[PDB]
């Protein structure tokens, strides 16, 4: 995995294991994803091709 969004640029040598959604917009997300409610993590793809 890796991350696409975070509150701010992490400091050097810090571990972030947070899960809360990142509010790109002023819209409240209330713990549930939606439009402008971006889940931070994203998986990769590792095919032999």
């Amino acid at each position, epitope marked *: 995995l890796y991350r696409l969004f975070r509150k701010s640029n992490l400091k050097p040598f810090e571990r972030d294991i947070s899960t809360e959604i990142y509010q790109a917009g002023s819209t409240p997300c209330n713990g549930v*994803e939606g439009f*402008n409610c971006y*889940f931070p993590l*994203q998986s990769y793809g590792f095919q032999p091709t």
Partner: nanobody
Amino acid sequence: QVQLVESGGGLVQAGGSLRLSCAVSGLGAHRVGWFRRAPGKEREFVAAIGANGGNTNYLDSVKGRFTISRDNAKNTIYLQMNSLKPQDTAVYYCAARDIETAEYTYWGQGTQVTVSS
């Protein structure tokens, strides 16, 4: 491009368990989500699962009796309803993300599931 098709939507009696399973073409690079349209409301989040992932998010209302799964073999995702409370009837849509900017990249045609009390 990748395409998703929804099947398995139909009326169920109160308390029934119907497993909503939508097929996906070329799954694996994407995370798929389940949203439903209330009769007078717009889509809201219910379930989503990342490939081979244990990352699970659910709405508090649908919490406690829903689970989502990804088979990894037939490229189809499975959502199980368990004893739906009648007001929870809605049309569920499969959607996927490549790089989410506004919402999920693709929207499925969806299906209708309804419950009689």
